[PDB]
Copies of this chain bind each other. A is one copy, B any other.
Amino acid sequence: QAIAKMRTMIEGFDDISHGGLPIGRSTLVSGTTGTGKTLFSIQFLYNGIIEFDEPGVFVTFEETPQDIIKNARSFGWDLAKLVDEGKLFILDASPDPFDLSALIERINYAIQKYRARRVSIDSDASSVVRRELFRLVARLKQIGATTVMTTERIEEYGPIARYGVEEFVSDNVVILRNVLEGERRRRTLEILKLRGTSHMKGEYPFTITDHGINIFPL
């Protein structure tokens, strides 16, 4: 009766997570700029829809839906079609040039409307942050969503996220790195923690290509 996992179908990931993302829980995906956070959270939804007909909700706070859709064309994915078919909903919480309760109600309404099984959320007292994140995680779990939530960090081998508390209130933590060494960049993915279940340890190299994320062996 240990926790079950949901397949990401992201090449390499379901192997190192031994089955995918823990179902009904949130996974924090943290990374410096341009590490593949949005791509991971899109590929999660896109594969849910295409492979399993599991509808998805994508929550954006800054990037517009138009740009998310445009950028996904880089990978040969037609997100506008999936939205039009009612398989995907891009929920725009991005500011026009905060009430967590209101946001949570909108996410819940969208999940019910689209019968969504997968959610991606992308992306000043740390006591405040800790409390609010806790509440968001709790509410998504109550709803039954399996969720990817991305977060920013500014150092490759420093704090997991910005406020030093995000990981401690997350059930699952994944870290994307983009390490510069000898003038070259190397992308890696690490599953740091999955509460109540197993996973491979340490950094695994990956690339972003025309196909999305590809994760490779040691």
Contact = CB atoms under 8 A, between A and B. Distances in A.
A214 interface: no
A84 to B, nearest CB: 15
- Counting chain B CB atoms within 10 Å of each CB, the highest count among A134, A182, A204, A210 belongs to A134
Contact of A196 (B71, B184, B202): B71
A112 interface: no
Interface residues of A, number: 62
Given A97-B135, A124-B126, A202 B173 contact: no
Contact of A134 (B71, B97, B171, B178): B97
Given A95-B138, A97-B138, A33 B70 contact: no
A196 B1 contact: no
A183 interface: yes
B196 A74 contact: yes
A47 B193 CA distance: 24
B201 A1 contact: no
Interface stretch (A52-60, A113-121, A152-160): A152-160
A99 interface: no
Interface of A: 1-3, 33-34, 38, 62-63, 67, 70-74, 76, 95, 97, 123-127, 131, 134-135, 138-139, 142, 152, 154, 157, 159-160, 164, 167-171, 173, 178, 180, 182-185, 188, 190, 192-198, 201-204, 208, 210, 218
